[PDB]
């Protein structure tokens, strides 16, 4: 419904990651993706793990660092009309439990997929490129800056 | 009796998965994808994993 | 501050499995919404909506598409639970015009039949003054015959009448404060009087769940706004200490003023403000108090004077007491009560006093008659029976629903009962099922609330008899069995 | 360089990685422009307590001066209409915005009484939650058919109508070009939104053209930003502060030449201008589809509480979910809606009352010309105009006192006038003090000429 009916906060999008059971749901979604990837018959284990890493990282990048704004009308007159979700999170507070969790989890996934890929160099470079693509925007310095003016408006 | 119970369980499935508010073709798409994934998983589990769970199911049936 | 009576409230936490399933449902809805947006963009499926005129195709687009996402994909699916028209007085039973949609709620067609005798749990008449036959109706009819309907000028101009002065003095007597002023809209009261009191250089401490009118009034003024947690006295005290100690943000200077905006009863949450603690804190830290009393001016109190009587406090302690006649008295309008100097400054420097048309004569007559009946000027036994029946109904309904296994928010005294649904599909399911059984309820979803709690609000009334409550309770029990809405672990 | 490259290639991998991270460290030191001092101090409990004790707040309201002209309200002992009683003195109303005299028709009162019997007074909820009646939809359909427009939306309060319509479409980052002499409701609507506001001279298309050209120049610099910036032009059909009409055709040309939408406010001109009284669009013959949004209030002409906005469904449907005065407020009481419907029926039955009002305004405006110390401000077609001091004193208080002297002396002469009221500290462009003259179809020619003679005599006696 309309924003402000049961809560005075102008931008609810900044609290969705601080809710109850959201972290458990995130981990369960990763696990379900891994299971449905293992379900494929003709794909080997290291390929499955690198696909898990790549798909999770791509989806995370798309949702956190690509889509900007809010999916609903907001009564602060579009203050966050250009900010992405990672920038909207917690009203710009750079370190928080949710931000720490979201930054840590791809690194743990990278460690697991490096162990299960037997440290192959091709998988190493693929997973490292993906991990950098996810971890670079999380830097506090890289806040509100668009390289070469891409996705600015 | 049992048909009513199964219809109730399907209703609960619709409520939980939010399929209740979708249109029929969206329900068809979601159900087809779900059954395809379950069938593929069963095929993989039978082909590769040993039938130890099948032995447990047979023991439970007996 | 100390309480003369126990202060009981309960906000049970969400079960973890319920939260996980809620997130599953929201994710499914978001994915299918993205799919539908993709289909509509490529014209694969014809769009059933209005578009800009052909002569303005080269203009910048009026709206942003993404802002309407939840409107196109979530709100429109369950759109039929809202905006239900009625063709009768909003009493204990209401008549609802029936409508159907053939394109999934994108357009509604009106059938000839009319649903009759729907138990009303959505209207706001707490004391049951919404009647088409009575003494108030006759007084309003006489004043309509004499004065006409509507005034065509402003209070500072020729538009000030004697009825308005009578209403203001009667309101001042009813509240117990020295003086009061009356306006023609509850929203406008806040939006047009908060900017007058404070300005640039002052601080406003606003609760987490304030109404949109209070927030808009605070934004219109140039003051700084800081938000504390709902009914968290520790957070309020911490904010007060930090504001007094550290001064203004950029150029550290003492604050010109500190104003605390609070409400009597919070409608959606169902809780009552901890007034003794707020009063003690404002006395200790020398702050001013603005008390929105729209939902409690008739519901609460042994004689229905509001929260200040409910806690047995002194009305002179609250700097500004605002209120609304819409909820309890059955007529539109609003008021602000306080000391004489405040009322004079408001009469001189209020936006609605200078630029806005004043109240209507039949409305003020209805308010006067209702409030005289409440305070017992007519001498009839009515006016106390209403309050007693409202209290009994609230206690009975809340106890019966809590012992059925449901999760309920708020105090045991508030006549507003938020039942908890927790899932997006169960919102529409509950609305449709309850309408199918002749009960009218109000359901609130995600963007209005936090994500995990979506709810249904029951508004009790003094006009609800015992048989009506029993019928509603048995239907609610049946629906809760059907939809598995009994999440409570403590009692079931 | 090649030999150096070969020597570097001769090195192991860990050594080169260590050298690289050392070089990155060196860069970090070189660009560590922050000169931290390595200190940390915190306040003491007694220091906090004494700081709290020193602070003393200002009073909630400033001390009041006893000379406030607005501190005294005129008290009307009865309905404000023709032959009203103000302050206990029987007078003739020249101050209430009741142009068509619809306040006291028997038909309007009968319709209001019937709706009161059927429904009651209060609606007991917002439009979302069981506050929508059939009378509301009926009135919306009637307004849409009357204005020859697709859709209309009803607010329960005149101010909130435009004050909530404007912020719904204009957001932060957009550009609004608003006339300098715009009513307080428009100003509050523009303040509620955080868009950029660019005032232009009253009824001056040269300044509007200049501002639009400057905006196009700014657009040429950053086209990407200019493709997501919306432009609005907010004007009034008949200005309240000046009584002057607006030049629509030039505004329409400017819109179509600079891609900037138009918002029209028609509170004064809704039921007084045009052959059928549909506003200034009939007066100029402009097509209704050129104007995106038309906002009016139902108080001045229809003589009932409320307001409305009319337009195409594409623009109107947004307000049902984004207008704050609509979403978070109780709906209009049914009896007021029924009175508005009956007033619309009366207006549709006979359109000669608009011609009668026009001729009465012409007579009074022509007769009032010739005062020695007062000048008429406003057009001949306006039902309400102003009288202002030709030569004013240095300060505003003496002007207000002289105007109130004239008003009181006229009121003792059985003519009820009023003085325009403003918020001095809040108005963007404060108009000069003036006496407001309002014309009604109830007033006869003899009464109008008597009022003109009385005003002339009193003004020439007082100003001298
Ligand atoms: C930025 C856009 C982000 C899109 C994220 C897509 C996530 C949804 C997805 O992958 O599956 C969706 C495809 O999704 C689509 O095919 C939609 C692709 C984008 C459409 C944008 C429309 C713009 C107007 C479909 O999901 P499903 O199989 O219905 O479950």
From Swiss-Prot, chain A:
Residues 1-17 are annotated as: Important for ceramide level-sensing. InterPro entries: ORMDL. Widely expressed. Expressed in adult and fetal heart, brain, lung, liver, skeletal muscle and kidney. Expressed in adult pancreas and placenta and in fetal spleen and thymus. It comes from the Eukaryota. Keywords: Asthma, Endoplasmic reticulum, Hydroxylation, Membrane, Transmembrane, Transmembrane helix, Ubl conjugation. It is linked to Asthma: The most common chronic disease affecting children and young adults. It is a complex genetic disorder with a heterogeneous phenotype, largely attributed to the interactions among many genes and between these genes and the environment. It is characterized by recurrent attacks of paroxysmal dyspnea, with wheezing due to spasmodic contraction of the bronchi. Ceramide-sensitive subunit of the serine palmitoyltransferase (SPT) complex, which is also composed of SPTLC1, SPTLC2/3 and SPTSSA/B. This is ORM1-like protein 3. It comes from Homo sapiens (Human). The gene is ORMDL3.
Swiss-Prot record, chain B:
Residues 23-27 are lumenal. The chain crosses the membrane at residues 6-22, 28-50. GO terms for cellular component: endoplasmic reticulum; endoplasmic reticulum membrane; serine palmitoyltransferase complex. It comes from the Eukaryota. Component of the serine palmitoyltransferase (SPT) complex, which is composed of SPTLC1, SPTLC2 or SPTLC3 and SPTSSA or SPTSSB. The heterodimer consisting of SPTLC1 and SPTLC2/SPTLC3 forms the catalytic core of the enzyme, while SPTSSA or SPTSSB subunits determine substrate specificity. SPT also interacts with ORMDL proteins, especially ORMDL3, which negatively regulate SPT activity in the presence of ceramides. Interacts with MBOAT7; the interaction plays a role in MBOAT7 localization to mitochondria-associated membranes. PANTHER family: SERINE PALMITOYLTRANSFERASE SMALL SUBUNIT A (PTHR47084:SF1). This is Serine palmitoyltransferase small subunit A.
Curated annotation (Swiss-Prot), chain C:
Changing residue 206 to R: Loss of catalytic activity with L-serine and palmitoyl-CoA as substrates. PROSITE patterns: AA_TRANSFER_CLASS_2 (PS00599). GO terms for cellular component: endoplasmic reticulum membrane; serine palmitoyltransferase complex. One of its GO terms (molecular function) is pyridoxal phosphate binding. It comes from the Eukaryota. InterPro entries: Aminotrans_II_pyridoxalP_BS, Aminotransferase_I/II_large, AON_synthase_class-II, PyrdxlP-dep_Trfase, PyrdxlP-dep_Trfase_major, PyrdxlP-dep_Trfase_small. Changing residue 131 to W: In HSAN1C; late onset; slightly increased activity with L-serine as substrate; highly increased activity toward L-alanine resulting in the accumulation of 1-deoxy-sphinganine. The chain crosses the membrane at residues 15-35. It is found in: Endoplasmic reticulum membrane. Pathway: Lipid metabolism; sphingolipid metabolism. Changing residue 82 to A: Loss of catalytic activity with L-serine and palmitoyl-CoA as substrates. Its main location: endoplasmic reticulum. The modification N6-(pyridoxal phosphate)lysine is found at residue 327. SUPFAM superfamilies: PLP-dependent transferases. It is a single-pass membrane protein. One of its GO terms (biological process) is sphingolipid biosynthetic process. Widely expressed. Disulfide bonds: none annotated. Changing residue 124 to A: Loss of catalytic activity with L-serine and palmitoyl-CoA as substrates. SPT complex catalytic activity is negatively regulated by ORMDL proteins, including ORMDL3, in the presence of ceramides. This mechanism allows to maintain ceramide levels at sufficient concentrations for the production of complex sphingolipids, but which prevents the accumulation of ceramides to levels that trigger apoptosis. This is Serine palmitoyltransferase 2. It comes from Homo sapiens.
Swiss-Prot record, chain D:
The transmembrane domain is involved in the interaction with ORMDL3. Pfam families: Aminotran_1_2 (PF00155). It is a single-pass membrane protein. GO terms for molecular function: pyridoxal phosphate binding; serine C-palmitoyltransferase activity. It is an enzyme of class 2 (transferase). Keywords: Acyltransferase, Amyotrophic lateral sclerosis, Disease variant, Endoplasmic reticulum, Lipid metabolism, Membrane, Neurodegeneration, Neuropathy, Phosphoprotein, Pyridoxal phosphate, Sphingolipid metabolism, Transferase, Transmembrane, Transmembrane helix. The gene is SPTLC1. Pathway: Lipid metabolism; sphingolipid metabolism. GO terms for biological process: ceramide biosynthetic process; positive regulation of lipophagy; regulation of fat cell apoptotic process; sphinganine biosynthetic process; sphingolipid biosynthetic process; sphingolipid metabolic process; sphingomyelin biosynthetic process; sphingosine biosynthetic process. The lineage of its organism: Eukaryota, Metazoa, Chordata, Craniata, Vertebrata. InterPro entries: Aminotransferase_I/II_large, AON_synthase_class-II, PyrdxlP-dep_Trfase, PyrdxlP-dep_Trfase_major, PyrdxlP-dep_Trfase_small. This is Serine palmitoyltransferase 1. Widely expressed. Not detected in small intestine. It comes from the Eukaryota. Its main location: endoplasmic reticulum. Changing residue 322 to F: In HSAN1A; severe form with early onset; reduced canonical activity towards serine and increased production of deoxysphingolipids; no effect on subcellular location at the endoplasmic reticulum.
């Amino acid at each position: 419904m309309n924003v402000g009916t049961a809560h005075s906060e102008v931008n609810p999008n900044t609290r969705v990651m601080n809710s109850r059971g959201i972290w458990l749901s995130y981990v369960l979604a990763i696990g379900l993706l891994h299971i449905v990837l293992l379900s494929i018959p003709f794909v080997s284990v290291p390929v499955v793990w690198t696909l898990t890493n790549l798909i999770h990282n791509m989806g995370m990048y798309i949702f956190l660092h690509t889509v900007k704004g809010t999916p609903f009308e907001t009564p602060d007159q579009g203050k966050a009309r250009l900010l992405t979700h990672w920038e909207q999170m917690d009203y710009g507070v750079q370190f928080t439990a949710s931000r720490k969790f979201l930054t840590i989890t791809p690194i743990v996934l990278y460690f697991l997929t490096s162990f299960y890929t037997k440290y192959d160099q091709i998988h190493f470079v693929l997973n490292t490129v993906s991990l950098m693509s996810v971890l670079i925007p999380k830097l506090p310095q890289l806040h509100g800056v668009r390289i070469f003016g891409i996705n600015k408006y | 009796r049992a048909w009513k119970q199964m219809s109730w369980f399907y209703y609960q499935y619709l409520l939980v998965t939010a399929l209740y508010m979708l249109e029929p073709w969206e329900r068809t798409v979601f159900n087809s994808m779900l059954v395809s994934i379950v069938g593929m998983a069963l095929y993989t589990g039978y082909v590769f994993m040993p039938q130890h769970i099948m032995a447990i199911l047979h023991y439970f049936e007996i | 501050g100390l309480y003369k009576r126990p202060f009981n409230e309960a906000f049970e936490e969400t079960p973890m499995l319920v939260a996980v399933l809620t997130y599953v449902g929201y994710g499914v809805l978001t994915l299918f919404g993205y799919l539908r947006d993709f289909l509509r963009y490529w014209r694969i499926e014809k769009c059933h909506h209005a578009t800009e005129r052909e002569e303005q195709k080269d203009f910048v687009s009026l709206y942003q598409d993404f802002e309407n996402f939840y409107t196109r994909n979530l709100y429109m699916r369950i759109r039929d639970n809202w905006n239900r028209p009625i063709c009768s007085v909003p009493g204990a039973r209401v008549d609802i015009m029936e409508r159907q949609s053939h394109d999934y709620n994108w357009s509604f067609k009106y059938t000839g039949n009319i649903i009759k005798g729907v138990i009303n749990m959505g209207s706001y008449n707490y004391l049951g003054f919404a009647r088409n036959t009575g003494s108030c109706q006759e007084a309003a009819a006489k004043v309509l015959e004499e004065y006409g309907a509507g005034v065509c000028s402003t209070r500072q101009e020729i538009g000030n009448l004697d009825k308005h002065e009578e209403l203001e003095e009667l309101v001042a007597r009813f509240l117990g404060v020295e003086a009061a002023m009356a306006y023609g809209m509850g929203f406008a009261t806040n939006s047009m009087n908060i900017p007058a009191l404070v300005g640039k250089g002052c601080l406003i401490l606003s609760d987490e769940l304030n109404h949109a009118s209070l927030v808009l009034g605070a934004r219109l003024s140039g003051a700084t706004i800081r938000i504390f947690k709902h009914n968290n006295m520790q957070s309020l005290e911490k904010l007060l200490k930090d504001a007094i100690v550290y001064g203004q943000p950029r150029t550290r200077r003492p604050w010109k003023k500190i104003l605390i905006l609070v409400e009597g009863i919070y409608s959606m949450e169902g809780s009552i403000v901890r007034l003794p603690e707020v009063i003690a804190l404002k006395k200790k830290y020398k702050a001013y108090l603005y008390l929105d009393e729209a939902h409690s001016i008739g519901a609460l109190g042994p004689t229905g004077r509001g929260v200040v009587e409910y806690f047995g406090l002194d009305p002179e302690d609250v700097d500004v007491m605002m209120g609304t006649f819409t909820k309890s008295f059955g007529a539109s309008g609003g008021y602000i009560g306080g000391k004489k100097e405040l009322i004079d400054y408001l009469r001189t420097h209020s936006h609605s006093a200078v630029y806005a048309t004043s109240l209507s004569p039949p409305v003020v007559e209805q308010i006067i008659t209702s409030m005289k009946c409440i305070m017992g000027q007519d001498g009839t036994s009515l006016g106390k029976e209403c309050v007693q029946q409202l209290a009994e109904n609230t206690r009975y309904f809340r106890r019966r629903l809590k012992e059925m296994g449901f999760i309920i928010y708020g105090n045991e005294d508030s006549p507003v009962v938020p039942l908890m649904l927790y899932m997006p599909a169960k919102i529409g399911a509950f609305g449709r099922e309850m309408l199918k059984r002749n009960i009218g309820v109000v359901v609130v979803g995600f963007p209005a609330t936090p994500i995990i709690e979506s709810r249904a609000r029951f508004c009790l009334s003094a006009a609800h008899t015992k048989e009506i409550l029993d019928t509603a309770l048995k239907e609610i029990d049946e629906v809760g069995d059907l939809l598995q809405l009994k999440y409570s672990r403590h009692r079931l | 360089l090649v030999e150096m490259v070969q020597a570097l290639y001769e090195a192991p991998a860990y050594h080169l990685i260590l050298e690289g991270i050392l070089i990155l460290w060196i860069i970090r030191l070189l660009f560590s422009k922050t000169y931290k001092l390595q200190e940390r101090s915190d306040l003491t409990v007694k220091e906090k307590e004494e700081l709290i004790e020193e602070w003393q707040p200002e009073p909630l309201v400033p001390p009041v001066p006893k000379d406030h002209p607005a501190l005294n309200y005129n008290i009307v002992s009865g309905p404000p209409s023709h032959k009203t009683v103000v302050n206990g003195k029987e007078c003739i109303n020249f101050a209430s915005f009741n142009f068509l005299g619809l306040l006291d028709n028997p038909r309007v009162k009968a319709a209001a009484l019937a709706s009161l019997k059927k429904y009651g007074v209060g609606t007991c909820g917002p439009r979302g939650f069981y506050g929508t009646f059939d009378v509301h939809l009926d009135l919306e359909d009637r307004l849409a058919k009357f204005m020859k427009t697709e859709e209309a939306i009803i607010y329960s309060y005149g101010f909130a109508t435009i004050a909530s319509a404007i912020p719904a479409y204009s957001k932060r980052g957009d550009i609004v070009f608003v006339d300098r002499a715009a009513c307080f409701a428009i100003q509050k609507g523009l303040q509620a939104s955080r868009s950029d506001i660019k005032l232009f001279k009253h009824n001056d298309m040269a300044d509007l053209e200049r501002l639009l050209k400057e905006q196009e120049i700014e657009d040429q610099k950053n086209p990407r930003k200019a493709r997501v910036t919306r432009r609005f032009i907010v004007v009034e059909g008949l200005y309240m502060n000046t009584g002057t009409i607006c030049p629509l055709p030039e505004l329409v040309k400017l819109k179509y030449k600079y891609k900037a939408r138009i918002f029209l406010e028609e509170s004064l001109s809704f039921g007084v201008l045009g052959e059928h009284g549909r506003g200034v669009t009939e007066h100029y013959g402009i097509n209704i589809d050129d104007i995106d949004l038309i906002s009016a209030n139902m108080e001045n002409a229809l003589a009932s509480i409320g307001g409305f906005c009319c337009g195409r469904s594409f623009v109107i449907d947004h307000q049902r979910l984004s207008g704050q005065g609509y979403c978070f407020s109780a709906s209009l009481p049914p009896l007021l809606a029924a009175a508005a419907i009956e007033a619309l029926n009366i207006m549709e039955e006979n359109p000669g009352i608009f011609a009668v009002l026009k001729e009465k305004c012409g007579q009074i405006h022509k007769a009032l010309q010739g005062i020695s110390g007062l000048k008429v401000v406003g057009e001949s077609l306006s039902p309400a105009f102003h009288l202002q001091l030709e030569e004013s004193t240095g300060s505003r208080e003496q002007d207000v006192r002289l105007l109130q002297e004239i008003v009181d002396q006229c009121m003792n002469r059985s003519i009820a006038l009023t003085q325009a009221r403003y918020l001095e500290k809040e108005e963007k462009c404060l108009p000069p003090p003036s006496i407001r003259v309002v014309v009604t179809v109830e007033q006869t020619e003899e009464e109008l000429e008597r009022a003109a003679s009385t005003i002339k005599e009193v003004a020439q006696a007082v100003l001298l």
